[PDB]
Each structure stands twice: as structure tokens, then as C-alpha cells.
């Protein structure tokens, strides 16, 4: 914001159709509101759709420029790379132990079955959508999650 007016932000006041989620329309064409074909110049039936902001510190709280940051992440069970600061333990076999591969908590027994997972597949669910087979993030082997006694 500047006391003389910061004109480095636009908000596309007018548009022909409603925008779909997660899209970007940076077209600077003249919005033809009337019936006469607009020839790219401002007229009584077509104006500039891109309007500038009047950000000034003199305005009260609510008209000041507010920076918005939208973090859009995907929490679907799939091969991921970002897995926080969660550290790793060793790999025990044939015993009732807890498991936390990529945030999936629970209790079961690893059996190291022969299921053939594809490179884009890491988790496997049963009829009841309960994850019964997982791919180890570090080792490329496949481990089943069977409930304990």
C-alpha cells in the first residue's frame, strides 16, 4: 500500500462467464457488454474489465491490502514425497506391532506377501476400505497389514 495509491493490482471486475475452480484468466480483452462488436477500444458499450485497486494506508481496517495464501494439498493415500519430520525405525516381521508409514496409524502384523503393486500404487484397501496392504516408502517390497490375534 502507498499513500499516493498503489495501482499494481487488478481484480477483473467484469467477466462474460463465471470462472471455474482453480483457473486463471489473464485475458486483457475489452469486455463487450453491448451488441455492437467492440473494436478493442473503450466505448459506451464496452469498458476495461480490469480495474485497479486504490490501496492507501489512510483507509481503515477492511479496505487495506490483505495477502492471502492458499495451501492446496492432497491427502489421498498415494506415493508421496513430503512426509514431515517424522523419523524412521526398523522393520520387524511376523509380530503384532504398530505401523506409521505415511501417517496411516493402526495395529497389525506384516507378512511380506506377493502382491504386485504398480509404481503409482502404494496403498491397498479391502472391501470395507480398510488398508490391508501397503508399499514401504523406503524399500520397494510389499507388506500386508493383517489384524492381530
Amino acid at each position: 500500500s502507498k499513500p499516493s495509491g498503489n495501482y499494481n493490482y487488478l481484480y477483473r471486475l467484469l467477466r462474460k462467464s463465471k470462472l471455474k475452480p482453480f483457473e486463471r484468466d489473464i485475458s486483457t480483452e475489452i469486455y463487450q457488454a453491448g451488441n455492437k462488436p467492440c473494436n478493442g477500444v473503450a466505448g459506451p458499450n464496452c469498458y476495461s474489465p480490469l480495474q485497479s485497486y486504490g490501496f492507501r494506508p489512510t483507509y481503515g481496517v477492511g479496505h487495506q491490502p490483505y495477502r492471502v495464501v492458499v495451501l492446496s494439498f492432497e491427502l489421498l493415500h498415494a506415493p508421496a514425497t513430503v512426509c514431515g519430520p517424522k523419523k524412521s525405525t526398523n522393520l520387524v516381521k511376523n509380530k503384532c506391532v504398530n505401523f506409521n508409514f505415511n501417517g496411516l496409524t493402526g495395529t497389525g502384523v506384516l507378512t511380506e506377501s506377493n502382491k504386485k503393486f504398480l509404481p503409482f500404487q502404494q496403498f491397498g484397501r479391502d472391501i470395507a476400505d480398510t488398508t490391508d496392504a501397503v508399499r514401504d516408502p523406503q524399500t520397494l517390497e510389499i507388506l500386508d497389514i493383517t489384524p492381530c490375534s
Binding site: 475452480p21 482453480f22 483457473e23 489473464i26 503393486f117 504398480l118
Partner: protein
């Protein structure tokens, strides 16, 4: 879908008006790498890839590119070798451009054979483009160079199908592969 084995089709374009006034998606597959860029490309009436034959390809499909807000080079993308039918499913929903691919050998006549062949996910990247038109990029390979002029020497075989929202009943085999499907509608 196409069954050529001479690397003719090696890219596609996506956009609304295919001009410099709006954004456009340019995807080109080379012999060793793939280039995916989102820029205000000025597509001509007949976009095609030029070759100076073996190397040194020229991008004569567009006239200018200024904004260029998104670029992507994966170089694993779509060639699937040179030894037949490579099916592709392009999806653009919620700003994410999903691409599917699958390589199925052909042992029949010049027609779509029976059976089932599920496609595998390839890449998912956001472009935020209101894609309404597309065109297939193909290398002419007229044994010499050609200018940027359209309607080149075409003298010197792909299928196109439109997708619709349909409910399917997928049948997985014992090995986890899809061997049958049913279109409920």
C-alpha cells in the same frame, strides 16, 4: 489412439482460441525428452513441427511466446518405444490436467481389436486453462526444411474419441489387473 511406428504424432496443443490473446498449452514429445509449457502461443492455421534432416528441430507451431508462466520437463513421455497402439486419455478438471497412457501390441487388421486394455496414470499438473479446442502436432519430415508458412507438403492414422461422465463397473483380476468393464448407461 494411433498405431503408427514412424514417430509422426509426437505432441499436441491445447487452448481456447489458440492465439496470443489467451493462454495455450504446448506439449511436444522429442526422441529423448518432453517439453510442456503454458504460454501465449500464437498458433498458426496449420501448426506442425519442422526437421532439418536427424536433429535441430524447429518449433514452427507458434509465432510468439511472452508470458510463459508455467514450464515442465519430465523426460522419463508418450513414445512408449518404437517397436503398436498407444492410447491416451486427456482430462482437465479442477484446473489439473491429467494424462493417461498405455502400450498394447497389435496383432490384428487395421481396426480396433476386441478385449480390454486399462490405461495407467502418467502425469498430473495444474495449468488452469479453459481448454475448449485442441490439435495434434505431427512431424512433417519432407526430407528438407520448410518455412513457417502453413499448408506445407503433406504429400511426403489416429483415432479421436470424446469422453463423457459415465458410470462403470470395473472387474479386477486376481493379479490386480482390470479384465472387464460394464458401461451402465
Amino acid at each position: 489412439a494411433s498405431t503408427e511406428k514412424s514417430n509422426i504424432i509426437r505432441g499436441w496443443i491445447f487452448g481456447t482460441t489458440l492465439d496470443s490473446k489467451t493462454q495455450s498449452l504446448l506439449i511436444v514429445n522429442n526422441a529423448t525428452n518432453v517439453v510442456i509449457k503454458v504460454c501465449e502461443f500464437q498458433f498458426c492455421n496449420d501448426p506442425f513441427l519442422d526437421v532439418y534432416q536427424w536433429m535441430e528441430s524447429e518449433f514452427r507451431v507458434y509465432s510468439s511466446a511472452n508470458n510463459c508462466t508455467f514450464e515442465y520437463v519430465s523426460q522419463p513421455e508418450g513414445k512408449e518405444g518404437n517397436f503398436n497402439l498407444r492410447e491416451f486419455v486427456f482430462k482437465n478438471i479442477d484446473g489439473y490436467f491429467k494424462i493417461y497412457s498405455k502400450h498394447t501390441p497389435i496383432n490384428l487388421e487395421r481396426d480396433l481389436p476386441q478385449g480390454f486394455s486399462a490405461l495407467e496414470p502418467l502425469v498430473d499438473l495444474p495449468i488452469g486453462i479453459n481448454i475448449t479446442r485442441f490439435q495434434t502436432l505431427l512431424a512433417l519430415h519432407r526430407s528438407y526444411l520448410t518455412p513457417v508458412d502453413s499448408s506445407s507438403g503433406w504429400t511426403a492414422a489416429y483415432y479421436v474419441g470424446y469422453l463423457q461422465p459415465r458410470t462403470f463397473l470395473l472387474k479386477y483380476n486376481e493379479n490386480g489387473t482390470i479384465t472387464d468393464a460394464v458401461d451402465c448407461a
